[PDB]
Amino acid sequence: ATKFPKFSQALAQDPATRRIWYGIATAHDLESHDGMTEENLYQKIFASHFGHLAIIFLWTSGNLFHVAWQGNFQQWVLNPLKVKPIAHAIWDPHFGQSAIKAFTRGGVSYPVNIATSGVYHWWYTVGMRTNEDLYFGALGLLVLSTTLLFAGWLHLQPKFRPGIAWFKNNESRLNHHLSGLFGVSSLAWSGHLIHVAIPESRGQHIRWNNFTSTLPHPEGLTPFFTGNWGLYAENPDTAQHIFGTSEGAGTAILTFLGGFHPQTQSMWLTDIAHHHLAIAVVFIFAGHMYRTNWGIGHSMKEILDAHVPPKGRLGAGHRGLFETITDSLHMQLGLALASLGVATSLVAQHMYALPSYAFMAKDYVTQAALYTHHQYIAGFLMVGAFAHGAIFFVRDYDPEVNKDNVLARMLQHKEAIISHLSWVSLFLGFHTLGLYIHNDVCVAFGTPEKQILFEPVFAQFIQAASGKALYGFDVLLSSSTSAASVASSKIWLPGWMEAINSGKNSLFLTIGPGDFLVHHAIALGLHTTTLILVKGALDARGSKLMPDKKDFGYSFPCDGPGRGGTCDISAWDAFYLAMFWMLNTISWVTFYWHWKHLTVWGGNAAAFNESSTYIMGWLRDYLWLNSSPLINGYNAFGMNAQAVWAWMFLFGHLIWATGFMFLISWRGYWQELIETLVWAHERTPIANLVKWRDKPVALSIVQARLVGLAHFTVGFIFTFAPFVIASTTGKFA
Amino acid sequence: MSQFAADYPWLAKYGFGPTVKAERWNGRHAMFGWLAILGTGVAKSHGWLPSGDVALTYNEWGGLAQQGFNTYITNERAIIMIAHVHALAVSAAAAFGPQVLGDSLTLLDGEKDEDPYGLFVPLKGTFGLTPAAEMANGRMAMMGIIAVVLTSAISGKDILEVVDIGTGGNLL
Amino acid sequence: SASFLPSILTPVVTLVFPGLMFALFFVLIEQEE
């Protein structure tokens, strides 16, 4: 009715404060709202997609506008290695005088924040040189956000709402996505690179007024049409190019030298355009696959129904998977989040391994922040994929449709899967903790020579097979006169070998026993998080303790204290438990990356190689040592520009600590406390005339777990980000 | 009207939105602000008291000193700001005070908004302190503010000095 | 002159806008059928 949860009649009649909390918390759960049909659900999701896309482009336009208005892009272009990039200007009426002088840094004269997101290098590579270019990009993205908001409004109109058959058109949507949204966009980016970014790297000034009359190549469409495509690769940029200017430059637009530009320590811009062109052609061909309207093409139902091994090896094969995926939005979303989590972990690895933006791998602060950023986001997406698979099992899985399916057999032998994940996790934890404690006791007792240090020969063999030639394995690419080393010897090999065998890059960092131990720790974390998530997903439909768990839904508090006790029995509680393990393993990964790069950037990799084998070495050489510039941001003798990072460090500590409130103390204590406070307010004079509308009650059990988990996570992020930024900023190496 | 009444029933209940009460109040504010613009023109003319070259130090104004681009806030802007804050305090006391001698800012319990309509509001036969004539004066004042803002923005001159074109020798 | 826009917009937005949104949201919460 007129009450706030208009979508839930059950919540609107709640006389307590639980109504507001649950109405806020269940606003986006479009499947369970009152009187919801499938078509209306799909239309609302389409409109929400448009609104979210507009939010993304508004955020990017805001970044562009703030760098254009309050930034030092003009000064940073002229000297990228010595000028600090600027995020935006600071307005604070709470500042003292010394805070105003302390935050006044860079070339500007106002208090200011130094950008650690690397947007300066990215825009500098793609041809931005002035503040007007950034402002025009901000205007374009503002107009795009306006257009997307209008489109979202338009597709909820009665004559423009698409039908349910339009949404479930898998072949047409995948054809158009794979061809257009991937290949045509990659082709357009290759065109932008060749027309603007490559000439800007060579000193030419190409903008909207002269791009249509300036030839990107001296010949121009003659090597392409005649078939002499190798003319575009001749005369590349020499190894004296000096980015942004024209001395030692070339006239090539599509090359595959491989390796790094010698000055910017990033990949060649002509390699990237060639890469994008190849990906464009491949994606257009791949989008030419599924039957839409012209006879040719596949049917996705027939491919899935055909793939049955001959004699019952996988049951009934993939029969019925087409009907389950199309009719369940939770399975599609789970597949999307799993793939996106793999993708953003891949970008996290490859942007430090193979930097593409000019004059990165020398800032080190953007280099740390981007990696930690993308790894934490990867962990979040990975947990969400399994959470939505559990939701799909709870309220979207049809057992009769999936009879003897490849999906039902997963539930058939779920006990074997959970038990073997248990065995792997227990084995890894036992052994890597035993090795770490052994090294701790051996170093503590004055005998570091008694440590168990396993040399990581498999990954070192992989590095040698990629071309690294200090391990002395002499195999494949590391050994000349080999088939792999000869076949590519005149396309991309010399640049790759001169980039992999130098000590200034992050390509295939030299690894020792500490790398072995911490990789085993990472495998432990991955296997245990997978254990919790897979067990929750597979036991979401029921177990021995609760055979009818599907009747109670995905998220419910418990099943009472009977038959032993049923605390944390739902699949939502399995998500809640696996969130801690994801945070733990991402913290392990980021600690390993940050300490290894802190020792490599300072030219002191021996410190990591000697102190990473035992836990006290970590504790006293990474965390205790690198906190000194952070915690000294403000003290009894004054303050500097890292005072905000010290304050945020303590802030994240306090939020992480007050999560333990909701995680350890449970409802009953607080409900009785609330009842005493209710008596207090009702029975005091003057103040009893002020009467509440909603009866105050304690937070519910699932709500309390969510609030404590959100506190734990926010405190986790807000205590790791200031450390990983200020410790790198406080050392410059 | 009924479009905005159906769109914002909570907001249109209290007379907020495109109603006659809002437009009358905005016209009155435009009249007083035209008087304030003329008074500030006289203030720059005679130089009664405030000087706009000196700065506001931190040691006497806190964080409401240097704020924009580490740029000083001047005594003239500070004086006009203090006068505006006092006008706003009187405004809050009038809006949230006893409804004596005054048309209310909002609509009271279940009362219909007035309608002197608009169009041309006949000046002849409505002379004196009549709601239609005061309404016309406020409407003209709002249009004068819009025209002055647009003219100053186009010409690149001061808003207080773009009206000095249309006076001639006046005040400043 | 663009040196006034921080000191104008930041208080207006950050203080005035969410206060009015909190009051409006609370009123919309507690209205009934």
């Binding site: 706030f4 208009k6 609302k44 409109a47 929400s48 448009f50 609104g51 507009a54 508004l58 506008f65 254009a68 208005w69 503040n131 007007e132 402002y135 901000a138 205007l139 503002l142 107009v143 956000s145 306006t146 908001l149 209008f150 979202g152 409004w153 909820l156 | 769109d7 923005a153 | 002159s1 663009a2 826009l5 919309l28």
Partner: peptide
């Protein structure tokens, strides 16, 4: 250097985007 007219133009575009955002949010409605 970004002029004041450019900033005010961006502010006008953002205001139009805000009104369309309100329209979309009230088209999904509560």
């Amino acid at each position: 250097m970004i002029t004041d007219s450019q900033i005010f133009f961006a502010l006008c575009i953002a205001l139009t985007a805000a009104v369309l955002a309100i329209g979309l949010g009230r088209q999904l409605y509560v």
